[PDB]
Amino acid sequence: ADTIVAVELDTYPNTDIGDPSYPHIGIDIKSVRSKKTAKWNMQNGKVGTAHIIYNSVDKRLSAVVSYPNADSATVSYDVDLDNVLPEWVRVGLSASTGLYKETNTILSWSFTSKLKSNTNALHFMFNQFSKDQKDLILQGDATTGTDGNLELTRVSSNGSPQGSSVGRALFYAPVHIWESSAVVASFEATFTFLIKSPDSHPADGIAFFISNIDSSIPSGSTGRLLGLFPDAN
Amino acid sequence: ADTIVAVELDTYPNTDIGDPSYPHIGIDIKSVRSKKTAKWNMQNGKVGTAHIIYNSVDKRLSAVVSYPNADSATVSYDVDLDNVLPEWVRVGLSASTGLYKETNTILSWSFTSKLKSNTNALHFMFNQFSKDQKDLILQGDATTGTDGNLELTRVSSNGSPQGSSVGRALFYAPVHIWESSAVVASFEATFTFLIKSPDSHPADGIAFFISNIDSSIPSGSTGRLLGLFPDA
Amino acid sequence: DTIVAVELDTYPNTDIGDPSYPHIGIDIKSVRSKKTAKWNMQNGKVGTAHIIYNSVDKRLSAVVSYPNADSATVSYDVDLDNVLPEWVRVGLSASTGLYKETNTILSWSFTSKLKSNSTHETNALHFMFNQFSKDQKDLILQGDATTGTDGNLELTRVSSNGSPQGSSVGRALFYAPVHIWESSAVVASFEATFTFLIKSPDSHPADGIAFFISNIDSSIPSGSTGRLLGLFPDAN
Amino acid sequence: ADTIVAVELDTYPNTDIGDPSYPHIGIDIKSVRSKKTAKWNMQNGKVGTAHIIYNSVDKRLSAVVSYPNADSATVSYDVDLDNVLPEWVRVGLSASTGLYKETNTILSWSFTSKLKSETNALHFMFNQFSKDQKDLILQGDATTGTDGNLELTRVSSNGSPQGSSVGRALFYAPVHIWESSAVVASFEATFTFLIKSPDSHPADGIAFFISNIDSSIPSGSTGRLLGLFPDAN
Ligand SMILES: CO[C@H]1O[C@H](CO)[C@@H](O)[C@H](O)[C@@H]1O
Ligand SMILES: CO[C@H]1O[C@H](CO)[C@@H](O)[C@H](O)[C@@H]1O
Ligand SMILES: CO[C@H]1O[C@H](CO)[C@@H](O)[C@H](O)[C@@H]1O
Ligand SMILES: CO[C@H]1O[C@H](CO)[C@@H](O)[C@H](O)[C@@H]1O
Ligand SMILES: [Ca+2]
Ligand SMILES: [Ca+2]
Ligand SMILES: [Ca+2]
Ligand SMILES: [Ca+2]
Ligand SMILES: [Mn+2]
Ligand SMILES: [Mn+2]
Ligand SMILES: [Mn+2]
Ligand SMILES: [Mn+2]
């Protein structure tokens, strides 16, 4: 299937498939059963920030999720992505709903990859998303243009979120994420999100992910699979 | 056909289609008959640099082509690209040969687009090109493994350039080059080239170009059309 | 010494060559702008200033926009090789006089690049400020200029009640000298961006904000409050 | 005295003050006795590259020193620089000679600091150094030339390096290296060097360092102290 490396912002505890008992941030390598998580004090209706980083020296994937004037949640996992991802990848944001629902609004998204050989660089930054955003591949229920925002999960005209939704946005350009004859390689992602819900239960979450170039939404990956994974193994 | 805005580095004077009597740099808007040129003191076998720039305020497309420790050649043309290019474009390098040949080697290529609305940004930079460069669309005789270099025109194993060759590389991502509800829009391209020839006559040149997304090499655009244009 | 500036002039001083309306202007070695443009200044709304110049076009351009309003633009063709010293400092100035306004800077970005003729490589400086701390050690504050109040740079005196004060001058310069041009340069570009909030109780707000490039050792000239925007000694 | 955090490129083994028996790269925190080293295959007369990085998430200072077409040497040390450096610092390159001599030529120097609270950022990049480089504070025998290079140690008119030399260049601007109300803070330094010597013994090395703003060359910091430290404690 697809090869997926992802940082999950999991809003629904699915303790059946190895989630903790609370909303968490987690690093998923080839599986939705995170290789490390951390308690996340998710704030319904407030605009949060995700910072993802990795470099070829430390070989450690790290993430930080803050709200302004609250303590950040952090998670790190040591992983050689040379042994996990293909040389050439695409980068994306995924989200999902199931029985429970939430808005999965992305307000901004930045990414930077650098690769000094034995530098090549890509950088994109989105603070506005247009009705036809030709440098984005939208999959599933994903839309651009409403208030200049990327809405990853289905939302009605009245701004009310929908259940059993999966949706992704991938940067159109392939990315050279690692090279054999490389001395240093870094990448860095940043996105802002707004997750609103009517219910005491919001579900199911947003992820930043790196996949094989041709990656598509796996079948029935709505809900607890965050549109990333086919099964819950 | 394709909509083409380009900065030509023309090494062969084709005075029949409006070239000056000397190697020149020129700004082509929807035509190979440049809207302004400037004398270019092209150096066979030396590594040169091209800088292209434009912004929504000045609305002026400018180019500089230098060799280290030589006087630069410059050309500018005032053009509102809102009235010329589509909102969404691709960026690329083209080159060509005809009766006469040159190596059209690209050693580096950088591009930056910015767009502050009523900022979004793209940046790529290439100093090495790999055997399979998946963020480049190579058209025509264009190759990337070489020696870390983009070779836009056919070159044999002994490093000798070939005649009647056309070849392009476009950045895979579409680029948002202008917007109606924009306050400022900038772009900037930079490439290094090495143009070598055995002959006194090298031909026919390299261009940086911005086109419609689906742009392909027009038919028999070898030689004086630099792989950009169908006719003159 | 030498001032090159983009003025955001909120008070028409028609005696020293201002138009009859609030304007944006390019001042070279004088407060009598070399070109202006009508500016529809919005009291209490957050605007944006974009300044740009390059060694090829040799044209200094500015855009001042308010969200969902027309941009005002001004350009002037000038070779800054013949005007500024090789090495400069960059800054924001503001002032008040009879009429007053808040001269609040909420963000300030600057980028200089300088690709050389000898070598292939570029020299570059970049700073970006979105927050300003109580002690901002990479800023030289002159006059009534302060940092820390809501993480903003307040260029003119503002009392405890948040009410702006008259007869105030104040500047902030980036601590590092900037190499703005070189003889053996092929291209040289610079770009400044700042957000401002200009609020006033009066129908008359005064007197304005400028981005400026000066000699390194530049200080607030004597009685440059009011119409001289803390940039110029006399109104010549 | 001065507070010094540095990445040493040590070319002379001073085993009496805790150097390994070979040329090494090391991470020095408030002392010339490195907190971690690594064997460095120093190449006399070839142009090398130093890459330093650190971030507030991992809190790990990492360095890589390569030559073209040779294996890089790497060193990392986990350190919270919040507990070590002052909030505001200056950045610099130091070098030295003693009994033995080497050219300590810097051909390029780049630095980038970021600080998300919007983000504050500084970036400078030098590929050419002018006769009067007004954004650099040169201390000791440090010069900038019409060869376009920063020469940290005394070099005669014969292109021949001199003994008992100390010399530093600090970026003129203070740098905000950390903040209490920060979510992420990163920095990254890169410099190219050429270290040439007539002898089999070259000495004594180059460092990238972060210090207190008002930092000056300590007394008798020639030779094995690399112009960084007063004593060898
Ligand atoms: C009871 O679990 C269901 O609802 C949750 C909440 O959305 C989903 O995560 C999950 O996939 C199921 O559809
Ligand atoms: C005789 O002219 C031919 O050869 C030159 C040299 O390339 C081309 O420019 C031109 O288009 C023709 O093909
Ligand atoms: C009547 O003019 C006075 O007030 C205006 C308003 O600021 C100033 O510009 C000027 O210097 C004078 O002090
Ligand atoms: C005996 O060692 C001396 O020479 C070496 C070589 O430079 C220096 O490192 C050291 O400080 C002393 O001056
Ligand atoms: Ca879950
Ligand atoms: Ca021609
Ligand atoms: Ca005035
Ligand atoms: Ca030593
Ligand atoms: Mn989970
Ligand atoms: Mn021509
Ligand atoms: Mn005026
Ligand atoms: Mn040592």
Side-chain angles (χ1 to χ4, degrees), chain B residues 74-88:
Chain B
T74 295
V75 70
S76 299
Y77 186 73
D78 288 290
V79 50
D80 189 5
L81 285 182
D82 296 9
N83 300 334
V84 169
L85 285 183
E87 209 171 303
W88 282 92

PDB file of all heavy atoms in Angstrom, chain B residues 74-88:
ATOM      1  N   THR B  74      22.679  44.101 -19.596  1.00  0.00           N
ATOM      2  CA  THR B  74      21.350  44.267 -18.952  1.00  0.00           C
ATOM      3  C   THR B  74      20.308  44.537 -20.036  1.00  0.00           C
ATOM      4  O   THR B  74      20.661  45.176 -21.042  1.00  0.00           O
ATOM      5  CB  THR B  74      21.353  45.417 -17.932  1.00  0.00           C
ATOM      6  OG1 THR B  74      22.229  45.060 -16.860  1.00  0.00           O
ATOM      7  CG2 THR B  74      19.972  45.749 -17.387  1.00  0.00           C
ATOM      8  N   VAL B  75      19.067  44.095 -19.814  1.00  0.00           N
ATOM      9  CA  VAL B  75      17.880  44.494 -20.628  1.00  0.00           C
ATOM     10  C   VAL B  75      16.672  44.603 -19.693  1.00  0.00           C
ATOM     11  O   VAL B  75      16.548  43.763 -18.783  1.00  0.00           O
ATOM     12  CB  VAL B  75      17.650  43.519 -21.802  1.00  0.00           C
ATOM     13  CG1 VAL B  75      17.161  42.156 -21.354  1.00  0.00           C
ATOM     14  CG2 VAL B  75      16.711  44.097 -22.837  1.00  0.00           C
ATOM     15  N   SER B  76      15.853  45.642 -19.872  1.00  0.00           N
ATOM     16  CA  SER B  76      14.549  45.830 -19.182  1.00  0.00           C
ATOM     17  C   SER B  76      13.464  46.105 -20.224  1.00  0.00           C
ATOM     18  O   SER B  76      13.792  46.683 -21.291  1.00  0.00           O
ATOM     19  CB  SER B  76      14.602  46.941 -18.160  1.00  0.00           C
ATOM     20  OG  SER B  76      15.550  46.663 -17.141  1.00  0.00           O
ATOM     21  N   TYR B  77      12.227  45.712 -19.919  1.00  0.00           N
ATOM     22  CA  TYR B  77      11.012  46.066 -20.695  1.00  0.00           C
ATOM     23  C   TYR B  77       9.829  46.221 -19.729  1.00  0.00           C
ATOM     24  O   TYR B  77       9.570  45.325 -18.909  1.00  0.00           O
ATOM     25  CB  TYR B  77      10.775  45.015 -21.774  1.00  0.00           C
ATOM     26  CG  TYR B  77       9.652  45.333 -22.730  1.00  0.00           C
ATOM     27  CD1 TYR B  77       9.789  46.319 -23.694  1.00  0.00           C
ATOM     28  CD2 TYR B  77       8.452  44.633 -22.679  1.00  0.00           C
ATOM     29  CE1 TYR B  77       8.761  46.604 -24.582  1.00  0.00           C
ATOM     30  CE2 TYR B  77       7.415  44.905 -23.557  1.00  0.00           C
ATOM     31  CZ  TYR B  77       7.571  45.892 -24.512  1.00  0.00           C
ATOM     32  OH  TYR B  77       6.541  46.140 -25.372  1.00  0.00           O
ATOM     33  N   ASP B  78       9.153  47.364 -19.794  1.00  0.00           N
ATOM     34  CA  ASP B  78       7.930  47.641 -19.004  1.00  0.00           C
ATOM     35  C   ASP B  78       6.786  46.824 -19.617  1.00  0.00           C
ATOM     36  O   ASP B  78       6.458  47.044 -20.798  1.00  0.00           O
ATOM     37  CB  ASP B  78       7.637  49.147 -18.961  1.00  0.00           C
ATOM     38  CG  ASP B  78       8.607  49.939 -18.090  1.00  0.00           C
ATOM     39  OD1 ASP B  78       8.559  49.785 -16.866  1.00  0.00           O
ATOM     40  OD2 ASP B  78       9.389  50.715 -18.644  1.00  0.00           O
ATOM     41  N   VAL B  79       6.200  45.912 -18.844  1.00  0.00           N
ATOM     42  CA  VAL B  79       5.077  45.040 -19.297  1.00  0.00           C
ATOM     43  C   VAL B  79       4.217  44.696 -18.078  1.00  0.00           C
ATOM     44  O   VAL B  79       4.795  44.292 -17.072  1.00  0.00           O
ATOM     45  CB  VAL B  79       5.610  43.768 -19.987  1.00  0.00           C
ATOM     46  CG1 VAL B  79       6.677  43.063 -19.155  1.00  0.00           C
ATOM     47  CG2 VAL B  79       4.482  42.803 -20.338  1.00  0.00           C
ATOM     48  N   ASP B  80       2.896  44.859 -18.159  1.00  0.00           N
ATOM     49  CA  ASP B  80       1.954  44.379 -17.112  1.00  0.00           C
ATOM     50  C   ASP B  80       1.642  42.913 -17.442  1.00  0.00           C
ATOM     51  O   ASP B  80       0.905  42.649 -18.419  1.00  0.00           O
ATOM     52  CB  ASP B  80       0.716  45.276 -16.999  1.00  0.00           C
ATOM     53  CG  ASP B  80      -0.196  44.997 -15.810  1.00  0.00           C
ATOM     54  OD1 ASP B  80       0.156  44.141 -14.973  1.00  0.00           O
ATOM     55  OD2 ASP B  80      -1.272  45.637 -15.740  1.00  0.00           O
ATOM     56  N   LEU B  81       2.223  41.979 -16.688  1.00  0.00           N
ATOM     57  CA  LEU B  81       2.118  40.534 -17.004  1.00  0.00           C
ATOM     58  C   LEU B  81       0.716  40.031 -16.662  1.00  0.00           C
ATOM     59  O   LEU B  81       0.393  38.925 -17.100  1.00  0.00           O
ATOM     60  CB  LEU B  81       3.221  39.764 -16.271  1.00  0.00           C
ATOM     61  CG  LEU B  81       4.611  39.923 -16.877  1.00  0.00           C
ATOM     62  CD1 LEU B  81       5.624  39.092 -16.115  1.00  0.00           C
ATOM     63  CD2 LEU B  81       4.609  39.543 -18.356  1.00  0.00           C
ATOM     64  N   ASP B  82      -0.080  40.834 -15.946  1.00  0.00           N
ATOM     65  CA  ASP B  82      -1.533  40.606 -15.720  1.00  0.00           C
ATOM     66  C   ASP B  82      -2.271  40.506 -17.059  1.00  0.00           C
ATOM     67  O   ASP B  82      -3.300  39.822 -17.103  1.00  0.00           O
ATOM     68  CB  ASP B  82      -2.183  41.738 -14.922  1.00  0.00           C
ATOM     69  CG  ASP B  82      -1.642  41.888 -13.513  1.00  0.00           C
ATOM     70  OD1 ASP B  82      -0.632  41.225 -13.198  1.00  0.00           O
ATOM     71  OD2 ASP B  82      -2.224  42.681 -12.750  1.00  0.00           O
ATOM     72  N   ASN B  83      -1.778  41.198 -18.087  1.00  0.00           N
ATOM     73  CA  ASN B  83      -2.469  41.357 -19.393  1.00  0.00           C
ATOM     74  C   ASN B  83      -1.877  40.383 -20.411  1.00  0.00           C
ATOM     75  O   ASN B  83      -2.300  40.462 -21.557  1.00  0.00           O
ATOM     76  CB  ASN B  83      -2.370  42.792 -19.936  1.00  0.00           C
ATOM     77  CG  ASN B  83      -2.974  43.847 -19.025  1.00  0.00           C
ATOM     78  OD1 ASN B  83      -3.864  43.536 -18.235  1.00  0.00           O
ATOM     79  ND2 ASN B  83      -2.493  45.087 -19.121  1.00  0.00           N
ATOM     80  N   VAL B  84      -0.950  39.502 -20.015  1.00  0.00           N
ATOM     81  CA  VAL B  84      -0.080  38.733 -20.967  1.00  0.00           C
ATOM     82  C   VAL B  84      -0.064  37.249 -20.600  1.00  0.00           C
ATOM     83  O   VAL B  84      -0.260  36.410 -21.501  1.00  0.00           O
ATOM     84  CB  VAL B  84       1.364  39.269 -20.974  1.00  0.00           C
ATOM     85  CG1 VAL B  84       2.294  38.333 -21.718  1.00  0.00           C
ATOM     86  CG2 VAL B  84       1.444  40.678 -21.542  1.00  0.00           C
ATOM     87  N   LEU B  85       0.271  36.951 -19.345  1.00  0.00           N
ATOM     88  CA  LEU B  85       0.329  35.572 -18.802  1.00  0.00           C
ATOM     89  C   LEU B  85      -1.000  35.222 -18.147  1.00  0.00           C
ATOM     90  O   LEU B  85      -1.739  36.092 -17.682  1.00  0.00           O
ATOM     91  CB  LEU B  85       1.457  35.474 -17.773  1.00  0.00           C
ATOM     92  CG  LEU B  85       2.879  35.423 -18.321  1.00  0.00           C
ATOM     93  CD1 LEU B  85       3.846  35.265 -17.166  1.00  0.00           C
ATOM     94  CD2 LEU B  85       3.064  34.286 -19.317  1.00  0.00           C
ATOM     95  N   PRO B  86      -1.320  33.915 -18.074  1.00  0.00           N
ATOM     96  CA  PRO B  86      -2.428  33.444 -17.245  1.00  0.00           C
ATOM     97  C   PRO B  86      -2.080  33.588 -15.755  1.00  0.00           C
ATOM     98  O   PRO B  86      -0.911  33.623 -15.421  1.00  0.00           O
ATOM     99  CB  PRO B  86      -2.574  31.967 -17.657  1.00  0.00           C
ATOM    100  CG  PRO B  86      -1.186  31.565 -18.122  1.00  0.00           C
ATOM    101  CD  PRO B  86      -0.614  32.817 -18.759  1.00  0.00           C
ATOM    102  N   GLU B  87      -3.102  33.657 -14.902  1.00  0.00           N
ATOM    103  CA  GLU B  87      -2.968  33.722 -13.423  1.00  0.00           C
ATOM    104  C   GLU B  87      -1.963  32.654 -12.946  1.00  0.00           C
ATOM    105  O   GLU B  87      -1.069  32.985 -12.144  1.00  0.00           O
ATOM    106  CB  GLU B  87      -4.350  33.560 -12.779  1.00  0.00           C
ATOM    107  CG  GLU B  87      -4.476  34.267 -11.444  1.00  0.00           C
ATOM    108  CD  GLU B  87      -5.880  34.318 -10.870  1.00  0.00           C
ATOM    109  OE1 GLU B  87      -6.780  34.835 -11.572  1.00  0.00           O
ATOM    110  OE2 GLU B  87      -6.070  33.838  -9.728  1.00  0.00           O
ATOM    111  N   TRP B  88      -2.103  31.418 -13.438  1.00  0.00           N
ATOM    112  CA  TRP B  88      -1.305  30.236 -13.029  1.00  0.00           C
ATOM    113  C   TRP B  88      -0.434  29.789 -14.196  1.00  0.00           C
ATOM    114  O   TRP B  88      -0.972  29.623 -15.302  1.00  0.00           O
ATOM    115  CB  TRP B  88      -2.224  29.106 -12.572  1.00  0.00           C
ATOM    116  CG  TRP B  88      -2.753  29.292 -11.184  1.00  0.00           C
ATOM    117  CD1 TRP B  88      -3.917  29.905 -10.811  1.00  0.00           C
ATOM    118  CD2 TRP B  88      -2.128  28.835  -9.972  1.00  0.00           C
ATOM    119  NE1 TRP B  88      -4.064  29.842  -9.451  1.00  0.00           N
ATOM    120  CE2 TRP B  88      -2.979  29.199  -8.909  1.00  0.00           C
ATOM    121  CE3 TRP B  88      -0.939  28.157  -9.689  1.00  0.00           C
ATOM    122  CZ2 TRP B  88      -2.665  28.911  -7.583  1.00  0.00           C
ATOM    123  CZ3 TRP B  88      -0.637  27.865  -8.378  1.00  0.00           C
ATOM    124  CH2 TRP B  88      -1.490  28.238  -7.343  1.00  0.00           C
TER     125      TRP B  88
END
